[PDB]
Amino acid sequence: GNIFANLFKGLFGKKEMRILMVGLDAAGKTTILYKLKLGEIVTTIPTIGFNVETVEYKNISFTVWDVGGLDKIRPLWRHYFQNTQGLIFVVDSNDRERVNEAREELMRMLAEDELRDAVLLVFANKQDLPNAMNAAEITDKLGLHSLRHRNWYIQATCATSGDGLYEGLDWLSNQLRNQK
Amino acid sequence: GNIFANLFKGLFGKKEMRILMVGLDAAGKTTILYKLKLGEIVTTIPTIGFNVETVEYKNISFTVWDVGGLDKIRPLWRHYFQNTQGLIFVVDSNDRERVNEAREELMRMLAEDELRDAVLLVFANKQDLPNAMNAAEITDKLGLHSLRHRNWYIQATCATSGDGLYEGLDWLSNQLRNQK
Amino acid sequence: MIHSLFLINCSGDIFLEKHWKSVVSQSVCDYFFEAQEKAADVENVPPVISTPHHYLISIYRDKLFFVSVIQTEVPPLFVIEFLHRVADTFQDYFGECSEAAIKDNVVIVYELLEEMLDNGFPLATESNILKELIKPPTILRSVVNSITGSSNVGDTLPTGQLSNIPWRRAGVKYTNNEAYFDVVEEIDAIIDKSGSTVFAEIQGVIDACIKLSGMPDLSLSFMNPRLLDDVSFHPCIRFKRWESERVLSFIPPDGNFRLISYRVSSQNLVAIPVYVKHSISFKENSSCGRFDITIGPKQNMGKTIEGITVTVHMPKVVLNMNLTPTQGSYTFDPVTKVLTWDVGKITPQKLPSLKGLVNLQSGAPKPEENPSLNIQFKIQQLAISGLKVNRLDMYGEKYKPFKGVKYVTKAGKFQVRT
Amino acid sequence: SELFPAVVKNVASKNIEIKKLVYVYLVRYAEEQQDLALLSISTFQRALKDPNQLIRASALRVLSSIRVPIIVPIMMLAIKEASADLSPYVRKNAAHAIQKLYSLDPEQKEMLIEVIEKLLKDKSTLVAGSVVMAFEEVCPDRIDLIHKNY
Amino acid sequence: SHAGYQTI
């Protein structure tokens, strides 16, 4: 059959893999998105709505939505839950004070029936901080090992150096662009 | 004659108009270049060498070099003077303290025989500052009216808002892309 | 460690100049030139030469001299192997290392040397990782680059570098799933004038050309493991399992690869395949003499001997030499007094031999001995060591690749006294 | 050496093989044209922050390699920043950069000892060897440091 | 290429 458009797209990478990025205030989500799209650090003010940029990597056209973490908009994430494939969840490497709220909201988001089919990737941003938690202790506080029937993984990362951002994209590429 | 490559280029804009950007420390040159290339504000540290980005605007492929203003590299600008068409000179809108050094260095740069054929455009960045000087007083301190045989112009601008950056590009487009 | 590398031909010209730490004056090569001059042959160059302010460690291989420079204390084995490895990699990327091969491809070889050695320290040494950091100079790749602006330099660190098996790139697929193994054996031997066995041994090595896809776990085992001793093992093998299970379970990397090497214990007599009848006359101060050599198979295990060549370095007394070969080719260079006979193949119906008269120097006394006899030979489909494989299992993949093995015995340092 | 200013202008080109070649040239001739060689340091600074870690490793190699005595402080900052890059390949290149700095500036020995002491605790298999190489190169007599890591 | 190799 005349499917040459799809073959032409696959000659360069048609994978889209829509991703919704959610998290708490000052976690660094927005900086992560904009450094992935551009590379540098950009002066930014608190985001109160949502942003969007399209990034291409390993022939995959990842699209990440940056919905804000402010409580004034927090329940609004429900409207973006449909039709997503990836869920980025940034955790501040030294937010021991608001870590429990982060885990509660993360579990709530995992409780959405629409998000049941997604893959969860936890970015432990702010890795540079000295008093930053390691990956193991962050996982221990989050209980991501207690999860079941959910493909998951965690990855330490430092945005100001971009440490591991490509690596998180690689992990998603392996799982989001899985066998099917 | 078979000049179809040049016609194809002119169907979309072949004008290059190499521009060298020079100025004093903390004038905002680097932020200007990167906002023109990208649009946002990017966290930056002092630049000690030089940068380059290519920006397209009104079918003109402007290329601006950001040679640093630090005194430790100041005389090095000589090596970039050749083959330039435009000279961007940023003045801090409230650098009344170092304004005389700025004018002295600007006159010195105008004294280069290679730069004799260029067009000079003075960007008065930091327009937002309250205690910022207006265009008229900046010109009065710079004596750009005392210049002769040199096409020139000055333009107030605020980088954090990008105020007038497109306008400076428009001015260069009119003069750099002049009748010939 | 290593400061810079000079690539110098046997001619005495300096072709490829490199530097890593500081500009070493080219005058330092004058000491190498003088040391080469003092010696009696290019082969006689020392590997450690001392100069007033530098040390030179040299390799000789393939008519090219590789002299490096050192200013601190470094273990000689380290430098000598790094240089032999740069030579090996040159062979891998260009078939061989020659001044023509170098000079024809200057840019790629300079990029390669830059990638491999960093501030005199090892950075990239494994073959497969180097294959992906910089591509081989394939002509189709070159025209593709010219067409699309594509580059020979990669932009992503290959995943194998950060993998628990740094010796092979991950995610490699081939439609033609197959793998070849090569067990090559060399017969080191010294044979006296009486034809007795002076000292002989078998040097055996396993080569493996692997074209498997995926992440296979190949297993190599043998019918007669007890014949294997002092066995070598590449990092790719799991030494613990070999010590326990006596099994070669491993993950081979891509491309050509030398798997393991071994020797045969002196407990079992080495089966010498070829014997020789030999006779040369040297009358004192005579202008002429006679030469008689007859090559014979002693223990061929019922297999043909082929690719036979006999080289003799005649003494200074010899001027010319009048012989007729029963087969192959007779060649004699009077300048170097080198007697080379291409023997080729041995037919049981008639044993090849070489005989005739030698045109000596009149007035020159007879040499105190006959120069020894070196002979090359190859046997196909026969390993004199009697080593045999047991099985070749695979785990981790689902395909069934083409599986095969060879057993080729090539003559070792086989020299016959006379 | 007469062509240094013409080459140095391209040190920020986006064409990668051109990058590698200009890196080669700067490494070759930096020690003669001190003032001219200063120009590439900002491009190196920016490259040190790139999300691609391999580019970071290349930038670290070149930034260490430049033997211009002025750039001592920025190089010192560069090694300290690379010290915990959380990218192990960058870590190995950091160990090599430590040896480079000690070769260039003897007076930083105490700081280099501190950063190397930081490095030895690494569990990564592909950094330990280079770190040990750095230890031998800079402070052979610090038998005290390795005691815990034996 | 497969020629010359004993089956294993």
Ligand SMILES: Nc1nc2c(ncn2[C@@H]2O[C@H](COP(=O)(O)OP(=O)(O)OP(=O)(O)O)[C@@H](O)[C@H]2O)c(=O)[nH]1
């Ligand atoms: N130290 C450190 N600061 C970081 C890092 N990543 C981001 N930040 C800083 O954290 C602050 C918040 O970052 P944002 O990206 O605005 O956070 P956000 O998740 O988008 O916040 P909302 O827009 O409210 O949802 C900024 O000052 C960032 O520069 C990091 O890895 N380390």
Ligand SMILES: Nc1nc2c(ncn2[C@@H]2O[C@H](COP(=O)(O)OP(=O)(O)OP(=O)(O)O)[C@@H](O)[C@H]2O)c(=O)[nH]1
């Ligand atoms: N208030 C204000 N600050 C500005 C403006 N433009 C730039 N800046 C700030 O001025 C400081 C210096 O800006 P840079 O762009 O790094 O200055 P530069 O001319 O590149 O300095 P060198 O790299 O040393 O040559 C930064 O903190 C900028 O955010 C402006 O229009 N208004």
Ligand SMILES: [Mg+2]
């Ligand atoms: Mg935000």
Ligand SMILES: [Mg+2]
């Ligand atoms: Mg700047």
